[PDB]
Amino acid sequence: PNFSSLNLRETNLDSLPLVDTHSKRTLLIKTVETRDGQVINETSQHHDDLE
């Protein structure tokens, strides 16, 4: 009876790294470059950071 080899596993306690809370920090730097008031560029830098 050397059981705990089963042990009906241990498909595990699963503190695994499957996280996004770990938050998905959507730093949306919407750089609206206007000239005179007209939009010339919108450099929308989505830094899509997973903390």
Partner 1 sequence: LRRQVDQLTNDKARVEVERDNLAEDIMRLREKLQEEMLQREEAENTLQSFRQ
Q: Which residues bind partner 1 (CB under 8 A)?
A: 33, 35-36, 38-43
CB of 41 to partner 1, least distance (A): 5
CB of 26 to partner 1, least distance (A): 16
Sign of CA dihedral 47, 28, 19, 22: positive
Q: What is the token pair recorded at 42?
A: 């919108």
CB of 25 to partner 1, least distance (A): 20
Q: In terms of CB distance, is 18 or 39 closer to partner 1?
A: 39
For residue 26, the cross-strand partners are 48
